[PDB]
Design an enzyme around this catalytic site. Structure first.
Site, PDB file in Angstrom:
ATOM      1  N   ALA A  18      88.719  36.545 131.169  1.00 39.58           N
ATOM      2  CA  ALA A  18      88.271  36.836 132.521  1.00 39.58           C
ATOM      3  C   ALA A  18      87.324  38.039 132.568  1.00 39.58           C
ATOM      4  O   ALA A  18      86.305  38.019 133.267  1.00 39.58           O
ATOM      5  CB  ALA A  18      89.446  37.053 133.422  1.00 39.58           C
ATOM      6  N   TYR A 176      81.537  22.701 124.665  1.00 41.98           N
ATOM      7  CA  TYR A 176      80.427  22.002 124.019  1.00 41.98           C
ATOM      8  C   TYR A 176      79.629  21.162 125.007  1.00 41.98           C
ATOM      9  O   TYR A 176      78.431  21.000 124.863  1.00 41.98           O
ATOM     10  CB  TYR A 176      80.905  21.162 122.854  1.00 41.98           C
ATOM     11  CG  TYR A 176      80.764  21.898 121.555  1.00 41.98           C
ATOM     12  CD1 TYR A 176      81.428  23.096 121.356  1.00 41.98           C
ATOM     13  CD2 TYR A 176      79.853  21.489 120.595  1.00 41.98           C
ATOM     14  CE1 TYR A 176      81.238  23.836 120.215  1.00 41.98           C
ATOM     15  CE2 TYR A 176      79.686  22.211 119.437  1.00 41.98           C
ATOM     16  CZ  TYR A 176      80.378  23.393 119.263  1.00 41.98           C
ATOM     17  OH  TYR A 176      80.218  24.138 118.117  1.00 41.98           O
ATOM     18  N   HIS A 237      85.620  18.914 120.406  1.00 43.88           N
ATOM     19  CA  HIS A 237      84.203  19.158 120.289  1.00 43.88           C
ATOM     20  C   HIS A 237      83.488  18.104 119.483  1.00 43.88           C
ATOM     21  O   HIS A 237      82.472  17.540 119.930  1.00 43.88           O
ATOM     22  CB  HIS A 237      83.957  20.569 119.705  1.00 43.88           C
ATOM     23  CG  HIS A 237      84.551  21.672 120.531  1.00 43.88           C
ATOM     24  ND1 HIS A 237      84.472  21.693 121.910  1.00 43.88           N
ATOM     25  CD2 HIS A 237      85.297  22.747 120.180  1.00 43.88           C
ATOM     26  CE1 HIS A 237      85.122  22.747 122.368  1.00 43.88           C
ATOM     27  NE2 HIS A 237      85.621  23.411 121.339  1.00 43.88           N
ATOM     28  N   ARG A 331      83.308  16.739 110.386  1.00 39.30           N
ATOM     29  CA  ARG A 331      83.376  17.808 109.372  1.00 39.30           C
ATOM     30  C   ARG A 331      83.323  19.245 109.939  1.00 39.30           C
ATOM     31  O   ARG A 331      82.269  19.704 110.392  1.00 39.30           O
ATOM     32  CB  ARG A 331      82.251  17.605 108.338  1.00 39.30           C
ATOM     33  CG  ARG A 331      82.482  18.264 106.990  1.00 39.30           C
ATOM     34  CD  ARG A 331      81.322  17.968 106.018  1.00 39.30           C
ATOM     35  NE  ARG A 331      81.217  18.966 104.945  1.00 39.30           N
ATOM     36  CZ  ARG A 331      81.247  18.677 103.649  1.00 39.30           C
ATOM     37  NH1 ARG A 331      81.377  17.426 103.259  1.00 39.30           N
ATOM     38  NH2 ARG A 331      81.141  19.636 102.739  1.00 39.30           N
ATOM     39  N   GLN A 369      73.358  24.209 117.133  1.00 41.88           N
ATOM     40  CA  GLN A 369      73.315  25.664 116.916  1.00 41.88           C
ATOM     41  C   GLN A 369      73.544  26.099 115.459  1.00 41.88           C
ATOM     42  O   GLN A 369      74.262  25.448 114.692  1.00 41.88           O
ATOM     43  CB  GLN A 369      74.290  26.403 117.849  1.00 41.88           C
ATOM     44  CG  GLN A 369      75.385  27.181 117.128  1.00 41.88           C
ATOM     45  CD  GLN A 369      76.777  26.868 117.659  1.00 41.88           C
ATOM     46  OE1 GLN A 369      77.062  27.048 118.850  1.00 41.88           O
ATOM     47  NE2 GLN A 369      77.658  26.409 116.773  1.00 41.88           N
ATOM     48  N   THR A 376      63.280  14.763 112.526  1.00 38.68           N
ATOM     49  CA  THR A 376      63.454  13.510 111.820  1.00 38.68           C
ATOM     50  C   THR A 376      62.933  13.602 110.416  1.00 38.68           C
ATOM     51  O   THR A 376      61.840  14.124 110.155  1.00 38.68           O
ATOM     52  CB  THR A 376      62.763  12.315 112.527  1.00 38.68           C
ATOM     53  OG1 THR A 376      63.411  11.093 112.137  1.00 38.68           O
ATOM     54  CG2 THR A 376      61.283  12.232 112.133  1.00 38.68           C
ATOM     55  N   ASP A 395      59.141  17.458 113.578  1.00 34.74           N
ATOM     56  CA  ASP A 395      60.017  18.534 114.063  1.00 34.74           C
ATOM     57  C   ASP A 395      59.814  18.978 115.519  1.00 34.74           C
ATOM     58  O   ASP A 395      58.684  18.979 116.041  1.00 34.74           O
ATOM     59  CB  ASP A 395      59.832  19.749 113.139  1.00 34.74           C
ATOM     60  CG  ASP A 395      60.701  20.918 113.519  1.00 34.74           C
ATOM     61  OD1 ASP A 395      61.935  20.784 113.443  1.00 34.74           O
ATOM     62  OD2 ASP A 395      60.146  22.018 113.741  1.00 34.74           O
ATOM     63  N   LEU A 396      60.924  19.372 116.151  1.00 36.57           N
ATOM     64  CA  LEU A 396      60.943  19.952 117.496  1.00 36.57           C
ATOM     65  C   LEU A 396      61.902  21.148 117.442  1.00 36.57           C
ATOM     66  O   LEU A 396      63.125  20.969 117.350  1.00 36.57           O
ATOM     67  CB  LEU A 396      61.436  18.945 118.546  1.00 36.57           C
ATOM     68  CG  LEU A 396      61.669  19.540 119.954  1.00 36.57           C
ATOM     69  CD1 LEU A 396      60.433  20.247 120.520  1.00 36.57           C
ATOM     70  CD2 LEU A 396      62.222  18.543 120.932  1.00 36.57           C
ATOM     71  N   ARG A 461      80.635  25.452 100.849  1.00 39.94           N
ATOM     72  CA  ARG A 461      80.455  24.451 101.878  1.00 39.94           C
ATOM     73  C   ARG A 461      81.766  23.726 102.113  1.00 39.94           C
ATOM     74  O   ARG A 461      81.843  22.844 102.962  1.00 39.94           O
ATOM     75  CB  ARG A 461      79.405  23.446 101.443  1.00 39.94           C
ATOM     76  CG  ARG A 461      77.971  23.905 101.563  1.00 39.94           C
ATOM     77  CD  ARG A 461      77.064  22.859 100.929  1.00 39.94           C
ATOM     78  NE  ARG A 461      77.137  21.592 101.639  1.00 39.94           N
ATOM     79  CZ  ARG A 461      77.824  20.542 101.216  1.00 39.94           C
ATOM     80  NH1 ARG A 461      78.481  20.614 100.072  1.00 39.94           N
ATOM     81  NH2 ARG A 461      77.845  19.418 101.929  1.00 39.94           N
TER      82      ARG A 461
END
Ligand SMILES: NC(=O)c1ccc[n+]([C@@H]2O[C@H](COP(=O)([O-])OP(=O)(O)OC[C@H]3O[C@@H](n4cnc5c(N)ncnc54)[C@H](OP(=O)(O)O)[C@@H]3O)[C@@H](O)[C@H]2O)c1
Ligand SMILES: NC(=O)c1ccc[n+]([C@@H]2O[C@H](COP(=O)([O-])OP(=O)(O)OC[C@H]3O[C@@H](n4cnc5c(N)ncnc54)[C@H](OP(=O)(O)O)[C@@H]3O)[C@@H](O)[C@H]2O)c1
Ligand SMILES: NC(=O)c1ccc[n+]([C@@H]2O[C@H](COP(=O)([O-])OP(=O)(O)OC[C@H]3O[C@@H](n4cnc5c(N)ncnc54)[C@H](OP(=O)(O)O)[C@@H]3O)[C@@H](O)[C@H]2O)c1
Ligand SMILES: NC(=O)c1ccc[n+]([C@@H]2O[C@H](COP(=O)([O-])OP(=O)(O)OC[C@H]3O[C@@H](n4cnc5c(N)ncnc54)[C@H](OP(=O)(O)O)[C@@H]3O)[C@@H](O)[C@H]2O)c1
EC number: 1.1.1.49
Lengths: 489, 489
Positions: A18, A176, A237, A331, A369, A376, A395-396, A461
């Site tokens: 809060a 999310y 999520h 994952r 994020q 792509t 790319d974007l 990883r």
């Protein structure tokens, strides 16, 4: 030409969520003129505070500027505090008469935020409906995870609340859903002919839904020990993200149709299978630079010999026309190699190869994020005096294409929605139960068998096994993709 | 372990193309070690020059560096010149015995480049086959546009050459085929699942094939006046690009199958229709800054009252399963607003709109020049506290992604191909005739009717009518796309 009074009741006001997130968030919407003109914030907690304490403890999270002085004065004038206990009838009587005494407070729309621990959820929702409900305006309750620990236990709570409130009054939070890119999924998918006729099982090899954190338990692993990673990040999520990726096109963008398409997807998934699972729990790194030399069991707060896993990878399947046989790899992990929340599609090899086994599987990547981006992976030809195809991309990248544009917190989005009565980014009861029924049998199973997790070093990883599970279901990695950020555009 | 002698005969050696492009190009392949170890350059022209003059006039186009001194010495030692006329039997006898006198010159593979005007093509090809052909190695002739002025006239030449040489000995040049991005079309199309299941008439609204130059006639408009823009740029370069876009997947990447798929496409197009045509010819601009204040008819070299058009836009249709009803807009012009050679696909609206007429048609753009790039226009969501979809893109820009990589000239590619015997980037005889049969009836028609062109000012994008022709066939423009280059990646 005419606006109703609004009351934002912060229950459990005195807490950290809060003070660190809810107070600071409602100011930001206030500050940015996003709330209805006649809005009042009401704090309710057992502690005996004054609007001055509430301000003193939160104002350091407001990120205020000097020009905001007036706004801040007015934000606090519209603030009040009412002390009380969570199940004391008298207490809820004070809180109720407190709101009607507010400018048109008998007609005002009331929003109750439950910034409280799960153990008061019943007492509070019961007491609210009994004595604090407006007979005129609307009443919407906002709730936080955890919503139960398994089907059966989430069912109790779910049917208790549903016994007092209608779905249109219940706002379950999965932050999310308040995330920019997670919300962009539906625009990418249903606004683009380029990303539509390709979203099938004839074109997609597998779908991967990742979530990583580069930190371990960090002091309070005794809290994590009780719920785990599946209940924590996977059952909500990641699963939420699955729904947005695998969902059929909705009749409309509204709560009803959007959320109908999601649970529909969920009701097509079977109880996760143990052979489709890999659990890990991090050990430390002697070469590590400090805080990361300690592993999970090196948190004196975590029970000695804890079998709890801080990393899990699961493979699900949507048994429906579009996704038949396409594995969905969930994952997530802690103490990993970086912070990253991501959605990846790996498409199938092209039919009738004419480039001699030189081509690689196409991949659409939606990075939630950090650093919002959609890119792509596609085959282009080696630039220059070469004819051999090589990997590149279209790319974007937000941060370059849209630098000026300033991106809000998931909590800013979600709270605004509530004021505006949009529910598409809130978890429905049925959507909830479908999620627990999928992971329950596994959770229980882990609870009765002490399957010792797969050791993995603070930083990696995860467990090698996790990559072997992916490869086994269809996901192929090559390590040939080379990427270089830019310059001199 | 064993390499044959090679002889590069430059016919018409003494000319500008030879001094400015052919000599300088063959050095570059030499310099960069791309040619066979035993390679000799032989110049043949009527003028009486010495290897020293040939060097003196070309060396200023070589772009040589001081470290290349040795290489340059050796490149010129492997050079020789033989003077002669283009139809004098004696002359071809000197040239032939000149090559056998070369290290293993009786077995050497002979490459004849016709850096000559179209008016000697018959005399030269005849004389070459008669006396200058190797009885051992291979003989390949390279030819430049123009290859005829219409079907009938391109047929004469075509069957004259075909009477002496087999297809595998004929290399017709369209320099666009030597262009990086034009060659990337087949990798983009047949290496990517993402650009494949979408390449149909169910997904594509129209296809546009543009070519612009920001300059006018520039002195020598008397030369252009004779052939026009259709014969110049449309009947070949644009049409070649059409073929690569509309072509079915080849059985292989080889000359045979690639070029089979191209003519196949061409044999499905009907004679261009006048109602599907817009011709322009530029006037000047009084506000123009100099050289561009003069229009087409302001070139004292261009016939007074010339009706010739310096800009044309045509709509073609491939009557086949994949492209039924999809208009292919061929668009080229001079004195325009910029230099740009480009391929664009505009896809069809998405079915079952759920974003209230907010979505715009997707567009894949392959920019051949300048600044090599491939980018997709797709719908993303307005970043921030907005839900309305807006236009963005997934971009691939050579110059940023591949800065190091150094990109060769179309002539460097094309000449190397000849040495290596690859023919996919050379115009086949049938491919040639299909092209003339499509545009002939129109060309003739323009020749018998003085349809006065559509005036347009030196600098504009052309005649407004051209945009109205596009819109009429299906291409919709909105002007809403906003693009901003980057920074701080
Ligand atoms: N911050 C998180 O990571 C997080 C994340 C997602 C969701 N949320 C949800 O939102 C809530 C945020 O509140 P919080 O995390 O700040 O919890 P909290 O600090 O433990 O307590 C919040 C408020 O509830 C009261 N409270 C706490 N424990 C109580 C107990 N055992 N009995 C009675 N009252 C008690 C305290 O007020 P009094 O002392 O005045 O009674 C306190 O002001 C969480 O419970 C969580 O469910 C939190
Ligand atoms: N728009 C952008 O900013 C941008 C654009 C393009 C590329 N890039 C970057 O360039 C780099 C390459 O991109 P990428 O990560 O998408 O592709 P990638 O390196 O080819 O990796 C393929 C995926 O497989 C996983 N993987 C790694 N090692 C594996 C192994 N041994 N076995 C099985 N799976 C394995 C990785 O997962 P995890 O690594 O997630 O664990 C990765 O996501 C990335 O770091 C990315 O950040 C950035
Ligand atoms: N540069 C271009 O824009 C261009 C573009 C594409 C293709 N090409 C093709 O490649 C050729 C390049 O050669 P070019 O453009 O440089 O032509 P050019 O300068 O007119 O002449 C080239 C050579 O041919 C000879 N020649 C010219 N006119 C002749 C005539 N009427 N009779 C006899 N011999 C003649 C000249 O040598 P002698 O005086 O020693 O006989 C000269 O050295 C062009 O014809 C064109 O077809 C050119
Ligand atoms: N990768 C890159 O470097 C990159 C990436 C993305 C965008 N951009 C740039 O951003 C700008 C916008 O991109 P865009 O040109 O592809 O899209 P656009 O501005 O939306 O233009 C759409 C197409 O319609 C044509 N057009 C213009 N006005 C028209 C009209 N009144 N009626 C009918 N058709 C009309 C234009 O043709 P013409 O203009 O060709 O005549 C244009 O190609 C471009 O200048 C481009 O260079 C660059």
């Amino acid at each position: 030409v005419q606006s109703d009074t609004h009351i934002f009741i912060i229950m459990g006001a005195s807490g950290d969520l809060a003070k660190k997130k809810i107070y600071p968030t409602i100011w930001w919407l206030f500050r940015d003129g996003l709330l209805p003109e006649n809005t009042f914030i009401v704090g309710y907690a057992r502690s005996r505070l004054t609007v001055a304490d509430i301000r003193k403890q939160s104002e350091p999270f407001f990120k205020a500027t000097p020009e905001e002085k007036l706004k801040l004065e007015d934000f606090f004038a519209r603030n009040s505090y009412v002390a009380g206990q969570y199940d004391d009838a008298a207490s809820y009587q004070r809180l109720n008469s407190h709101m009607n005494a507010l400018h048109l407070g008998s007609q005002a729309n009331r929003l109750f935020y439950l910034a409280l621990p799960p153990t008061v959820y019943e007492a509070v929702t019961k007491n609210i409906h009994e004595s604090c409900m407006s007979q005129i305006g609307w009443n919407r309750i906002i709730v936080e995870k955890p919503f139960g620990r398994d089907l059966q236990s989430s069912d109790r709570l779910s049917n208790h609340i549903s016994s007092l409130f209608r779905e249109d009054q219940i706002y379950r939070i999965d932050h999310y859903l308040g995330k920019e890119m997670v919300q962009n999924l539906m625009v990418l998918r249903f606004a683009n002919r380029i990303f539509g006729p390709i979203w099938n099982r004839d074109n997609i090899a597998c779908v991967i839904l990742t979530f990583k954190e580069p930190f371990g338990t960090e002091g309070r692993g005794g809290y994590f020990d009780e719920f785990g990673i599946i209940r924590d990040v996977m059952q909500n999520h990641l699963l939420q993200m699955l729904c947005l990726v695998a969902m059929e096109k909705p009749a409309s963008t509204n709560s009803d149709d959007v959320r109908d398409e999601k649970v529909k997807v969920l009701k097509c998934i079977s109880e996760v299978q143990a052979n489709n699972v890999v659990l890990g729990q991090y050990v430390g790194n002697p070469d590590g630079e400090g805080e990361a030399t300690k592993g999970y069991l090196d948190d004196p707060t975590v029970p000695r010999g804890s079998t709890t896993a801080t990393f899990a990878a699961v493979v699900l399947y949507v048994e429906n026309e579009r996704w038949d046989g396409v594995p969905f790899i969930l994952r997530c992990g802690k103490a990993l190699n970086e912070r990253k929340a991501e959605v990846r599609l790996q498409f199938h090899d092209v039919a009738g190869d004419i480039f001699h086994q030189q081509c690689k599987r196409n991949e659409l990547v939606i990075r939630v994020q950090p650093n919002e981006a959609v890119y792509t992976k596609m085959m282009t030809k080696k630039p220059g005096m070469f004819f051999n195809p090589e990997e590149s991309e279209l790319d974007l990248t937000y941060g370059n294409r849209y630098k000026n544009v300033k991106l809000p917190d998931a909590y800013e989005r979600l709270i605004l929605d509530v004021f505006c009565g949009s529910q598409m980014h809130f978890v429905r009861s049925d959507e909830l139960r479908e999620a627990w029924r999928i992971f329950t049998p596994l959770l229980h199973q882990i609870e009765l068998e002490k399957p010792k997790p797969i050791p993995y070093i603070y930083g990696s990883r995860g467990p090698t096994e996790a990559d072997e599970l992916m490869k086994r279901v269809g996901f192929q990695y090559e390590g040939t993709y080379k990427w270089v950020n830019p310059h001199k555009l």
